[PDB]
Every structure is written in C-alpha cells, then in structure tokens.
Amino acid sequence: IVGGYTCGANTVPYQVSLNSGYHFCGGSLINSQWVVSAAHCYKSGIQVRLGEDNINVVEGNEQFISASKSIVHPSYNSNTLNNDIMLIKLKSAASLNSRVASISLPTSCASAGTQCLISGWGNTKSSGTSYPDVLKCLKAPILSDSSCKSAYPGQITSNMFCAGYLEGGKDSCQGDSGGPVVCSGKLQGIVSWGSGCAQKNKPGVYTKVCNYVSWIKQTIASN
Ligand SMILES: [Ca+2]
C-alpha cells in the first residue's frame, strides 16, 4: 500500500497472508474454512496465515493452516487478468473471534463513489522498494467505469473496477495482490493489477466480486 496508514493490530480481522516460505499475496477469509484471493496468486504449497499483524514476529493471535485445495476460476485468463479470482480451502476450520473473523460476501454490486478499505503488506513506495512488516490500510473510492476505461483503454472488462485516486500518490502495490477491498462491510474487490503503483491517471484495478457470488457459493457447497 502506497500512501496509506498503519491499520493497527487485528483491526482488519478477515485479512490473510498467503505464505510459501515468505509472504507473497493477500486474501480474505469468507468463512471458517475458505479464503478468496486472486488467481494470479496461485501456487502449490500455500500456508494461510490468519490473525497476523507483524508477519515477521509471532505476536500471539496467529493461526497457521495449510491449504488442502485451491480452485482457480474456470475462465481465468492470465494475459488479460480477466476473472482474477481463486478459492482456497483450509485443511481445518479456523477458530473465529473478534481478531479473526470472516467478511460477508455482497448481495449487490457497489456503485462508483462508495468509499472502501484496502489493506495489505505490499510495497509502500511508488519508486523503489520498501516492504512493511505490519499491515497497512488505505481508504479509497470506487471510480466510475468511464474514468476507469479512459485510464486503461481496451483493458477493463465487466469483471473489473478501478478504485483510488487519479491524482496518484495512494494505491495498492506489489505484494497486496489477492487482498480485500471492503465497502460498507462487504467484500467488493480483490487487489488485481495496475500500471505501476500510485501513478497519475493509473488507478488500481480490482476484481469485481459481486459478479462471482454464485460461483463462490456453488463451489463451497460441493467441495
Ligand atoms: Ca505475526
């Protein structure tokens, strides 16, 4: 997250870290045994880390659970990043409380102008590299589809939305991928892609979760 603020320990209780020997992507806990992330975060051998703040220090609220199965969306296209969503089943159910909690799925899509919370352990610099060890947060609005398509001609599908600031300075970045965009207490987006981080006229692009609710619910019900 560039231009964000330190969330505070366990203030974003649905945020997960995906770990393969190191943190490589975020995700969101949507019930006691399932996480949603970005398909471009797919790899074998994932450990899901819940209850994290400092990802390099054991602080006492963590739960470390290996994945038992990963399901990339059937129509994911790695070249365009259309349908950039995947589900991860945990080998065992997590223990839910105030510091580790699921986030509700949306019943309706969010409209442009709605303010959302984006979080992650990604890079904090738009030029260069500095990775934080504690979770960072950013409040940002959903932008109009017209402005999103004008910033990224020919690249925005119906399964994507833009959020952030056209003036730059505040954005999600590398290492935030897969993490949540939460608006009015519902998971509306997944950190997906952008042209650099925090550049003028190049806001972040997010997977539009409301289009996938049926696929999520059907997949969970049978796996
Ligand atoms: Ca920790």
Residue 72 assigned ligand-binding role: no
- My answer on whether 205 and 109 are in the same domain is yes
Pair 182, 118 in one domain: yes
Residue type, 89: K
- Looking at the fold, whether 119 and 202 belong to one and the same domain comes out as yes
Q: Other CB atoms closer than 10 Å to residue 129's CB: what's the count?
A: 10
For 164-220, the three-class secondary structure string (H helix, E strand, C coil) is CCCCCCCECCCCCCCCEEEECCEEEEEEEECCCCCECCECEEEEEHHHHHHHHHHHH
Q: Is 57 annotated as a binding residue?
A: yes
Catalytic: 177? yes
CA of 202 to the centre of ligand 1 (A): 32
In the residue annotation, 40 being an active-site residue is answered as: yes
45 and 136 part of one domain: no
Total domain count, the chain: 2
Query: Do 86 and 19 fall into the same domain?
Result: yes
- C-beta separation of 84 from 38 below 8 A: yes
54 is in an annotated binding site: yes
Instruction: Say yes or no: 97 and 3 in one domain.
Output: no
Q: Are residues 65 and 94 in the same domain?
A: yes
Task: Please give the distance, rounded to the nearest whole angstrom, from the Cα atom of residue 133 to the centre of ligand 1.
Answer: 9
Distance from C-alpha of 205 to C-alpha of 122, rounded to nearest angstrom: 15
Does one domain contain both 41 and 2? no
Question: Do 107 and 8 fall within a single domain?
Answer: yes
Residue whose token pair is 């997977």: 207
Domain range for 124 is: 1-12+103-210
| Shared domain check, 129 and 39 | no
Catalytic residue among 23, 28, 84, 119: 84
Is 59 one of the annotated binding-site residues? no
Is 84 catalytic? The answer is yes
Q: Are 1 and 176 in contact (CB under 8 A)?
A: yes
